């Protein structure tokens, strides 16, 4: 009969959000949960205007909602996701993502994201992976270097059972 005093939450508006993921300036995260064994992060990311990613290969599931803003896939130009939309995209999709220049603000979006996420060009040349794992270096490096005190929600690795 376990015991639990505290919920596992994390308050997305009581620290800034990790500037740059990547070293790619316009895509600003606040990660929330992640599952490098099961391949699995639940993230809160901040687009600004302009921007126009490469293309992602998804490896699993992708369940996103948009909070606020605009962004569009390049290959469905008439199916925007703007202030309250969802999407589900299936594994073996590959989509990339923009927001137009002309938005006034950021774009705001939670996600789900399962699997890992492969990247090529347009042209198909493959330029690398990103899984759970990848992206918590990231973030683990990114709260040290911006000296940001957040806190986020991680699952260890699976070992032999005491």
């Known amino acids: 009969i376990t015991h639990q005093e505290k919920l596992l939450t994390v308050d997305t508006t009581a620290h800034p959000f990790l500037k740059a993921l990547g070293g790619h300036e316009g895509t600003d995260i606040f990660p929330l949960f992640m599952d490098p064994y099961n ?39 008439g199916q925007k996701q703007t202030a309250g939309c969802y999407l589900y995209e299936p594994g073996g999709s590959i989509h990339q993502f923009n927001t137009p220049r002309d938005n006034e603000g950021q774009t705001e979006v939670i996600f789900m994201l399962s699997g ?23 973030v683990d490096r990114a709260i040290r270097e911006q000296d940001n005190g957040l806190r986020y929600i991680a699952a260890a690795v699976p070992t032999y059972a005491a």
């Open 116 to 138: 890992c996420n492969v990247n090529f060009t347009q042209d198909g040349t493959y330029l690398g992976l990103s899984d759970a794992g990848v992206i918590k270096n990231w």
């Open 39 to 77: 391949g699995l992060m639940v993230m809160r990311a901040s687009f600004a205007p302009g921007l126009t990613l490469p293309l992602h290969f998804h490896t699993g599931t992708v369940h996103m909602y948009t909070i606020s803003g605009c962004w569009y896939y390049t290959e469905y130009p």
